[PDB]
CSV table of C-alpha atoms and ligand atoms in Angstrom, one decimal:
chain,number,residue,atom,x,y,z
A,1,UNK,CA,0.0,0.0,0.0
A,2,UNK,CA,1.1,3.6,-0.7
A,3,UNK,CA,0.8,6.4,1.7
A,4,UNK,CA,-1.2,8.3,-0.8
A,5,UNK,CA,-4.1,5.5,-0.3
A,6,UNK,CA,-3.4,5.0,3.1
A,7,UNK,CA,-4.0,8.7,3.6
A,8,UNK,CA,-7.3,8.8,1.5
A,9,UNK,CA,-8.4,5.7,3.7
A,10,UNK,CA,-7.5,6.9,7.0
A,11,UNK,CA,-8.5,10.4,7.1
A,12,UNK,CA,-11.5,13.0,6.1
A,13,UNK,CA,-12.0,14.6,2.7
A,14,UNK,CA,-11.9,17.8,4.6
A,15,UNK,CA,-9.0,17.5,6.3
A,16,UNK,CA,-7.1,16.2,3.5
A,17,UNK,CA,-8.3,19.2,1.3
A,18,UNK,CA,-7.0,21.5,3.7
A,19,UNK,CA,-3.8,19.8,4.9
A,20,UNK,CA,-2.9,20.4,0.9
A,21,UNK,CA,-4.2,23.4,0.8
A,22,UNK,CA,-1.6,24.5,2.9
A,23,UNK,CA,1.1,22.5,1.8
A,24,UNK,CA,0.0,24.7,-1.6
A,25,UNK,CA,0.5,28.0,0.3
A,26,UNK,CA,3.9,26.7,1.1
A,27,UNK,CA,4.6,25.4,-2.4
A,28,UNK,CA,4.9,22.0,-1.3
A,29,UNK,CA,3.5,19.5,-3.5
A,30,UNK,CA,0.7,16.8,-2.0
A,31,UNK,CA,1.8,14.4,-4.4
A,32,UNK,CA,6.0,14.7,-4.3
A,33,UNK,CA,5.5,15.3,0.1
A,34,UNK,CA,3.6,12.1,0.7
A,35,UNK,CA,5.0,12.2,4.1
A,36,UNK,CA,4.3,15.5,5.0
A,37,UNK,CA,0.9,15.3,3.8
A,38,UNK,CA,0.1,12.8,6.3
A,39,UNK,CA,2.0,14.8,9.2
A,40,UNK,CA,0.1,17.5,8.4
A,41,UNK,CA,-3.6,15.4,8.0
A,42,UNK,CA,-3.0,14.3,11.6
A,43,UNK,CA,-2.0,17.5,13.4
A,44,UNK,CA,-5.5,19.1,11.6
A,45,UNK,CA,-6.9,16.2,13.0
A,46,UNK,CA,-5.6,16.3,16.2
A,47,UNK,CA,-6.7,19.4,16.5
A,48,UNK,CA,-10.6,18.6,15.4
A,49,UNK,CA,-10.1,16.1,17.9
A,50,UNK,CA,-9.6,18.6,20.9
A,51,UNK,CA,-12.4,21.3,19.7
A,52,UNK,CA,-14.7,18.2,19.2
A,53,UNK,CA,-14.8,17.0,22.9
A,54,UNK,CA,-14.9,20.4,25.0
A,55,UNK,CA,-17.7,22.3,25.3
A,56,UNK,CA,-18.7,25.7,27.6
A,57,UNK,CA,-22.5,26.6,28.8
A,58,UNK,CA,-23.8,30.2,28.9
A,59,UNK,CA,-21.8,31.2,32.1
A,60,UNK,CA,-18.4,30.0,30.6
A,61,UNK,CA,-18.7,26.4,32.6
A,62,UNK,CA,-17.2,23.4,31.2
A,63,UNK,CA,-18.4,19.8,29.3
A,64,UNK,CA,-17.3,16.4,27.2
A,65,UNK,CA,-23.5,25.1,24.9
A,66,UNK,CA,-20.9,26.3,22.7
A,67,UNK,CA,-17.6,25.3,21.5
A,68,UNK,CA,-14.6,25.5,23.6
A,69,UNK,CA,-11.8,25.8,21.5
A,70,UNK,CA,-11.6,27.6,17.6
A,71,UNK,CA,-9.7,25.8,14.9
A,72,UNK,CA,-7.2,28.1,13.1
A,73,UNK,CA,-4.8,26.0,11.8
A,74,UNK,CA,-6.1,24.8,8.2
A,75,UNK,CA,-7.5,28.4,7.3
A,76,UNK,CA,-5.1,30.6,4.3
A,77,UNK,CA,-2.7,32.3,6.6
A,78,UNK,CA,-4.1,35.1,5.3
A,79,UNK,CA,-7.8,34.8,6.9
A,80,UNK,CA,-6.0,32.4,9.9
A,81,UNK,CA,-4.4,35.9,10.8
A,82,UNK,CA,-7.5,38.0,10.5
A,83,UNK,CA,-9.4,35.7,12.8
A,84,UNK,CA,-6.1,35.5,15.5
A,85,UNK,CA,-5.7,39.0,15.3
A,86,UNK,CA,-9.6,39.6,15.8
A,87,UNK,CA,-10.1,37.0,18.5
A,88,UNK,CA,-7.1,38.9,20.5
A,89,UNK,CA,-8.7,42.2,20.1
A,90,UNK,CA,-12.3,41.2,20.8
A,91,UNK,CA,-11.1,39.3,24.3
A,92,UNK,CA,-8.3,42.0,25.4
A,93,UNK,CA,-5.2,40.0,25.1
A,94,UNK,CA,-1.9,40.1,23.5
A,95,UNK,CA,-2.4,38.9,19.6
A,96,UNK,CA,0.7,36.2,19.4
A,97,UNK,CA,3.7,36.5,17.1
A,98,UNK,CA,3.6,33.0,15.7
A,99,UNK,CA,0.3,32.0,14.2
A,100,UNK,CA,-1.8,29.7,16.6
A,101,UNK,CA,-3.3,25.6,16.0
A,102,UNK,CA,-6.3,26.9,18.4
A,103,UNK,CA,-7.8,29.5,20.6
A,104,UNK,CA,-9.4,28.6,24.1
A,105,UNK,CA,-12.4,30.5,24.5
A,106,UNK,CA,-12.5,29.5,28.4
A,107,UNK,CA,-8.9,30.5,29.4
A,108,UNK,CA,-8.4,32.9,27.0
A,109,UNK,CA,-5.5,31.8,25.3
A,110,UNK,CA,-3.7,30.9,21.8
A,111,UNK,CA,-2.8,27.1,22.0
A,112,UNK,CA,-0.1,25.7,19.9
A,113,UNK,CA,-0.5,21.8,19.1
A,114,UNK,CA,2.7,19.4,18.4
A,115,UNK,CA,2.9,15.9,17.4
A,116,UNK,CA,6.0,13.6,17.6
A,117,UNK,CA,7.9,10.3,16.7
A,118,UNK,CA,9.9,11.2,20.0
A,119,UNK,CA,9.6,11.7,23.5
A,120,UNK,CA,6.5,14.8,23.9
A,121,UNK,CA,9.3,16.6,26.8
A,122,UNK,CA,11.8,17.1,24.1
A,123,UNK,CA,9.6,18.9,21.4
A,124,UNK,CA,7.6,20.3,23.8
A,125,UNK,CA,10.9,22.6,25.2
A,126,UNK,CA,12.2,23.0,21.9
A,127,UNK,CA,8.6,24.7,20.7
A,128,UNK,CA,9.0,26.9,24.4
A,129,UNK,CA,12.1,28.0,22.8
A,130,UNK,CA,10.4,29.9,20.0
A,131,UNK,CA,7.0,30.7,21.5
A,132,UNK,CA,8.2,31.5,25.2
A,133,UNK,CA,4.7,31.8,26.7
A,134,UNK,CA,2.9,33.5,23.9
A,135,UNK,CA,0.8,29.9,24.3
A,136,UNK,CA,-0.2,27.2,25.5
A,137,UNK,CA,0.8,24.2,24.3
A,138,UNK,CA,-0.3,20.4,24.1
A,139,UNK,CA,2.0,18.0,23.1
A,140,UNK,CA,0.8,14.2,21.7
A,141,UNK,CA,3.7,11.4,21.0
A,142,UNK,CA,3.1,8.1,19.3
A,143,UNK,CA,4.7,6.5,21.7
A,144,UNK,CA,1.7,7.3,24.6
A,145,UNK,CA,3.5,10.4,26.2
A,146,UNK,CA,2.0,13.8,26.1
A,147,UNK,CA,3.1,17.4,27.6
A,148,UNK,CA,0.5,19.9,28.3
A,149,UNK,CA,1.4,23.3,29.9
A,150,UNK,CA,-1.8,23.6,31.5
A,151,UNK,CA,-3.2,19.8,32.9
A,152,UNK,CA,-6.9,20.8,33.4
A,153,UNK,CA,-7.2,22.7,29.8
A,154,UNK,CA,-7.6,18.8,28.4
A,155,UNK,CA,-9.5,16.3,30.6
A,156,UNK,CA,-6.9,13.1,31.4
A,157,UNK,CA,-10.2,11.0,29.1
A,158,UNK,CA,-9.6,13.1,26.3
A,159,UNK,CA,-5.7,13.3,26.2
A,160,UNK,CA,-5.8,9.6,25.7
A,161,UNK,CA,-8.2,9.8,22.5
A,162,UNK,CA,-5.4,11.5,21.0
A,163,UNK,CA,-3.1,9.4,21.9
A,164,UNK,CA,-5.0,6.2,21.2
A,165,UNK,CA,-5.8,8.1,17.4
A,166,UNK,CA,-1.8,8.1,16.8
A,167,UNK,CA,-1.3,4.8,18.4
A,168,UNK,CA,-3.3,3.2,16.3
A,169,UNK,CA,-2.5,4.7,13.2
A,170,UNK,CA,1.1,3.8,14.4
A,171,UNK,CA,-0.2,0.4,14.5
A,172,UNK,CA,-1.5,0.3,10.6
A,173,UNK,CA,1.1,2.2,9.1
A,174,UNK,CA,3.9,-0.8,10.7
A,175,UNK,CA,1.4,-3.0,9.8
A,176,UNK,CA,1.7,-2.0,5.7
A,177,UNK,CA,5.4,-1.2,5.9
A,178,UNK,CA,4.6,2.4,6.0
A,179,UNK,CA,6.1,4.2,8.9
A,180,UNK,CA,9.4,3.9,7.7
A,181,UNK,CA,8.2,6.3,4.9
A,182,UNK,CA,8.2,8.6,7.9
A,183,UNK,CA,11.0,7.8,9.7
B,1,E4Z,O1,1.7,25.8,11.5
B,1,E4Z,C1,2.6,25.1,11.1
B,1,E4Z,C2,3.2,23.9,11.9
B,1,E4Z,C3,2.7,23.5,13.2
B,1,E4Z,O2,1.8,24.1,13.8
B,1,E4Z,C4,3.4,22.4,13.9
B,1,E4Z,O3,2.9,22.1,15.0
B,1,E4Z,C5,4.4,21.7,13.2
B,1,E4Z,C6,4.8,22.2,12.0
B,1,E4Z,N1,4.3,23.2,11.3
B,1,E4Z,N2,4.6,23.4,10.0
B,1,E4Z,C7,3.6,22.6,9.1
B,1,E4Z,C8,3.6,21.2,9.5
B,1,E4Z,C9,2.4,20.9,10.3
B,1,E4Z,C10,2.2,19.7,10.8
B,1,E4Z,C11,3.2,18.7,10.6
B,1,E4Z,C12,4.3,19.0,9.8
B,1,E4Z,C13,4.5,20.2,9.3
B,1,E4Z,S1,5.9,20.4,8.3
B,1,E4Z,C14,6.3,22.1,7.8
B,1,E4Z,C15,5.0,22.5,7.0
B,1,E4Z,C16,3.8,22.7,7.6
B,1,E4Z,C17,2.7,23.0,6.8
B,1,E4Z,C18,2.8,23.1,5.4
B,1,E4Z,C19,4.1,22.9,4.8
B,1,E4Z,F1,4.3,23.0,3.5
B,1,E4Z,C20,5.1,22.6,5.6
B,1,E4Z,F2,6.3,22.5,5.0
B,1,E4Z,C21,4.6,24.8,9.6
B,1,E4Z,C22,5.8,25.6,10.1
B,1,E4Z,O4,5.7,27.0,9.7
B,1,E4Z,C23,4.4,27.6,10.1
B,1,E4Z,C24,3.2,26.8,9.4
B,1,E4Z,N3,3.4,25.5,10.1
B,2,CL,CL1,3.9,31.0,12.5
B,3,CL,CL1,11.0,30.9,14.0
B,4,MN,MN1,0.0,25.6,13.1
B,5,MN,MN1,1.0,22.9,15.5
C-alpha cells in the first residue's frame, strides 16, 4: 500500500483538502511530500479532535453550549491571521507572534498543538524556545507520552483519545510497511 491510499483511507476529505491546501500556500507539492501530507492530515486532525470534545454553557462552565476551542490551523494564513488577530482584540489580550493551531475561549489563550515520533518533553521545550509563553501548548507522542502546559485545559479521558488516534495509526502504518516512509 502507498501512503497516498493509506491517507485517502484513514483520514477526512476535509481534512485532507486542507492539509494540501496548505502544503499549496507553502509550495509543497501533496503528491511529491507524501510524508508531510500525512503529518500535516494528523496535526489538523488532532486538532478537530480537541475542539470536538470540550464544550462551555452560557456562564463560561465546562463539558465532554458552545464550543470550547476555535480551529485556526487549516485556514489561508491570510484569513487564519485575520481571525487571531480579531479573536485577541475582541477578548483583550496580547495577539501572538507566531500564528496559533487553536484559541481557548475558556482560558483565554492561543494554543499551539505538536505531534511527535519522539519523547512529547523534548519537542515540547524545543517549541517553548520559539513561543516563550505567547501559548499554551499540548504536546501528543506516538509513543503514549503527552506534555500539556496547563493539565486541566484537556480532561486526562480526552488526552488519551489522542493518543490512542496516533497509536493506532502507528499500528497500521507498521502494519503496511509504512512508517518507515516517515522515519
Ligand atoms: O503551523 C505550522 C506547523 C505547526 O503548527 C506544527 O505544529 C508543526 C509544523 N508546522 N509546519 C507545518 C507542519 C504541520 C504539521 C506537521 C508537519 C508540518 S511540516 C512544515 C510545514 C507545515 C505545513 C505546510 C508545509 F508546507 C510545511 F512544509 C509549519 C511551520 O511553519 C508555520 C506553518 N506551520
Ligand atoms: Cl507562525
Ligand atoms: Cl522561528
Ligand atoms: Mn499551526
Ligand atoms: Mn502545531
Amino acid at each position: 500500500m502507498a501512503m497516498d491510499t493509506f491517507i485517502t483511507r484513514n483520514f477526512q476529505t476535509t481534512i485532507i483538502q486542507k492539509a494540501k491546501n496548505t502544503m499549496a500556500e507553502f509550495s509543497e507539492d501533496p503528491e511529491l511530500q507524501p510524508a508531510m501530507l500525512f503529518n500535516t492530515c494528523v496535526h489538523l486532525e488532532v486538532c478537530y479532535v480537541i475542539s470536538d470534545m470540550n464544550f462551555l454553557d452560557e456562564e463560561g462552565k465546562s463539558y465532554t453550549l458552545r464550543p470550547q476551542y476555535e480551529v485556526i490551523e487549516g485556514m489561508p494564513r491570510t484569513i487564519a491571521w485575520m481571525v487571531q488577530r480579531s479573536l485577541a482584540q475582541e477578548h483583550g489580550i496580547e495577539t501572538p507572534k507566531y500564528l496559533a493551531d487553536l484559541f481557548d475561549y475558556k482560558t483565554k489563550r492561543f494554543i499551539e498543538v505538536g505531534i511527535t515520533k519522539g519523547l512529547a518533553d523534548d519537542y515540547f521545550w524545543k517549541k517553548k524556545e520559539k513561543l516563550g509563553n505567547s501559548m499554551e501548548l499540548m504536546i501528543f507522542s506516538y509513543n503514549q507520552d503527552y506534555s500539556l502546559s496547563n493539565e486541566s485545559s484537556l480532561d486526562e479521558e480526552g488526552k488519551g483519545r489522542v493518543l490512542s488516534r496516533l497509536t493506532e495509526l502507528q499500528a497500521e502504518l507498521s502494519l503496511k510497511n509504512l512508517w518507515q516512509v516517515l522515519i
